[PDB]
């Protein structure tokens, strides 16, 4: 069992409510819109978590 694959990933913390969390993304592209999945090559395998 690896903690690196069972540790929740912090996406976004609180914005204190006011002002509301506004994110303008003029570069509307899939990696920046929906996020990205990285790939660390440990021991030679593209092992992700």
């Amino acid at each position: 069992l690896d903690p690196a694959q069972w540790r929740p990933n912090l996406l976004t913390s609180s914005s204190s409510g006011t002002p509301p969390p506004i994110v303008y993304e003029p570069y509307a592209t899939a990696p920046r819109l929906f996020g990205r999945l990285d790939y660390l090559v440990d021991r030679g395998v593209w092992s992700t978590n």
Partner: protein, 49 residues
Amino acid sequence: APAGLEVEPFPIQMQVILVGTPEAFEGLEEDPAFSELFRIRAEFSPTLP
């Protein structure tokens, strides 16, 4: 690339000066962002007196 450094947006201090023929710009003047970014038009007269 298996991963990529997340480069934070950086304020731009430079002053870009595009150079080109009128034909090289009429194909680039159709973008309103060009007309809003490049306000100063330096035209070279084809003929001097």
